[PDB]
């Protein structure tokens, strides 16, 4: 129940040239080989991760990752013009640990189904997390940590169509997106099992029935914004997909092979401030991303239904929200 | 110093559209959503959708769902709500509005002046 | 649904005495109401926020309490501006209204 700067810590190596080692290594220390868990013996806290300072630590933190890799060639702001050198790079996200310094400790909720905010009643602390890919995106949340138990839904109110719907899934679905080559160099798809991710979808469907009792439950696609929030955005080796999820939020899933058309772009909407980033063309070559789908942040529209049906469209494009995905579980207390 | 000016009133016929705007001033345009609210003539609020102006994201009373389309224009601070396939009941006040504070939006404590449609033949 | 039914449809008092004016929630929904008074010709104006707390400008003789799903809005000594319409508002929901008239 306090604030305090963390510091953080990766397995990142001096030698390794991949941009996110290279940032690790200047600002993480190694990871700590000894971990020291201690579970609080009859002890209930409070956790809000709609309200928690290690959310925006770990915001500038990453925006200062991809300042450092993801240079734009331009970058057009309200009040700014900056024109700079935009050499590819290699990028792959390497596991982070958030670490509270001396004085102060890492309260962490063991409950399996505690939905962020409340009370906790299966407490320890800890000197760190466990490791956290900074993977940006939208619609769907990539390589994160799954649920141990059953799908959880949290949202600072569910009653208030406004507020974001973060779901953790508790068995990952693999989606693999591709660039190829030897024509449209700016051309990729995806594919996704279609039967693993209907099941996911009707789970998902039954764990939001549960609070809305008596209602359909339907996934639909978004309803409008940028291209970052309309379509699967997200960053591969260093090239910016959108991809096209209209075959994935849908009431008629395919049992088989489901193939989403996808744009490699170079003009981006940033989502660290307000403004556009404009990168080089595409490298050359095959450019592949295999990841693992954990999480979804959707939207329920407003206004009571007339065919009793609750209507869900993939959202995001604020990324405080992936990184409560992932820190949710977790608080900075001090010792006193 | 918050003002939300909209657009002069509009007569159509059925089937057709019209879009309202609403200019933001005194504040930051892309911090707090924008809400539309209709109300008829002698009749009550009618809430229909709401943006975020920073990424355009929209959430649509169910009710307009497939006729009604809300964006925006930040260099301008600008939102725009265009309602499509225009009938005598779209007859109303349209305002947009802004709740108080960035956490909690729908205490809407600053609206704009109202831009009156008239539907008909 | 979720519903908010005002009441009374009309309310008709005299200058100086107390209006009190009810507004149901279906079903629970803890203390996010608003009230809003709105003029013939002017748009909706705020006066109560989260179902006790004044908007800005609001006189101290405006009043909301409750909690659950009965909430009231009482006005102490009415004066000549205070007759409008006045509206209940839960999230995206908004009550029909009560209107208050002057009393002859």
């Known amino acids: 129940e306090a604030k305090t700067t963390l510091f953080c810590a990766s397995d990142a190596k001096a030698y390794e040239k991949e941009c996110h080692n290279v940032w690790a290594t200047h600002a993480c220390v190694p990871t700590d080989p000894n971990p020291q868990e201690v579970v609080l013996e009859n002890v209930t806290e409070n956790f809000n991760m709609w309200k928690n300072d290690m959310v925006d630590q770990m915001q500038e933190d990453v925006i200062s990752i991809w300042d450092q890799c993801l240079k734009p060639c331009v970058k057009l702001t309200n009040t700014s013009t900056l024109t700079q050198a935009c050499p590819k790079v290699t990028f792959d996200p390497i596991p982070i640990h958030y670490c509270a310094p001396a004085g102060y400790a890492i309260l962490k909720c063991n409950n399996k189904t505690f939905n962020g905010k409340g009370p906790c009643n299966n407490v320890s602390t800890v000197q760190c997390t466990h490791g956290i890919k900074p993977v940006v995106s939208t619609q769907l949340l990539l390589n994160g940590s799954l649920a141990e138990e059953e799908i959880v839904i949290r949202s600072k109110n569910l009653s208030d169509n406004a507020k974001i719907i973060i779901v953790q899934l508790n068995k990952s679905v693999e989606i693999v997106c591709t660039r190829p080559n030897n024509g449209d160099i700016r051309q990729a798809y995806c594919n996704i099992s279609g039967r693993n991710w209907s099941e996911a979808v009707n789970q998902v469907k039954k764990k939001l029935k549960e609070h809305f009792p008596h209602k359909n439950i339907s996934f639909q696609s978004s309803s409008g914004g940028d291209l970052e929030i309309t379509t699967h955005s997200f960053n591969c080796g260093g090239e910016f997909f959108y991809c096209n999820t209209s075959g994935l939020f849908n009431d008629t899933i395919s049992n088989a092979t489901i193939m989403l058309p996808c744009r490699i772009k170079q003009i981006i909407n940033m989502w660290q401030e307000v403004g556009k980033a404009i990168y080089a063309p595409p490298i050359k070559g095959n450019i592949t991303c295999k990841s693992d789908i954990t999480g979804l942040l959707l939207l329920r529209d407003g206004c009571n239904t007339t065919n009793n049906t609750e209507i869900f469209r993939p959202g995001g494009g604020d990324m405080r929200d992936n990184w409560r995905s992932e820190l949710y579980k977790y608080k900075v207390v001090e010792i006193k | 110093q918050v003002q939300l000016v909209q657009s002069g009133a509009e007569v159509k016929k059925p089937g057709a559209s019209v879009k309202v705007s609403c200019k933001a001033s005194g504040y930051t345009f892309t911090g707090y959503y924008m809400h539309w609210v209709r109300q008829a003539p002698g009749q009550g609020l009618e809430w229909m959708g709401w943006?975020?102006?920073?990424?355009?994201?929209?959430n649509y009373c169910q009710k307009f769902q497939g006729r009604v389309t809300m964006t925006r224009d930040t260099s301008i601070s600008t939102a725009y709500m265009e309602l499509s396939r225009l009938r005598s009941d779209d007859t109303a006040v349209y305002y947009c509005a802004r709740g108080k504070n960035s956490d909690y939006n729908w205490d809407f404590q600053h609206w704009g002046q109202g831009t009156l449609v008239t539907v008909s033949s | 649904e979720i519903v908010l039914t005002q009441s009374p449809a009309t309310l008709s008092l005299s200058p100086g005495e107390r209006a009190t004016l009810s507004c149901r929630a279906s079903?629970?929904?803890?203390?996010?109401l608003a009230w809003y008074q709105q003029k013939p010709g002017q748009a909706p104006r705020l006066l109560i926020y989260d179902a006790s707390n004044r908007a800005t400008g609001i006189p101290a003789r405006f009043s909301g309490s409750g909690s659950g799903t009965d909430f009231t809005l009482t006005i102490s000594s009415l004066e000549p501006e205070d007759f409008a319409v006045y509206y209940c508002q839960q999230y995206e929901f908004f009550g029909q209204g009560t209107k208050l008239e002057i009393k002859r």
């Open positions: 079903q629970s929904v803890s203390s996010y």
């Open positions: 943006i975020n102006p920073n990424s355009g994201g929209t």
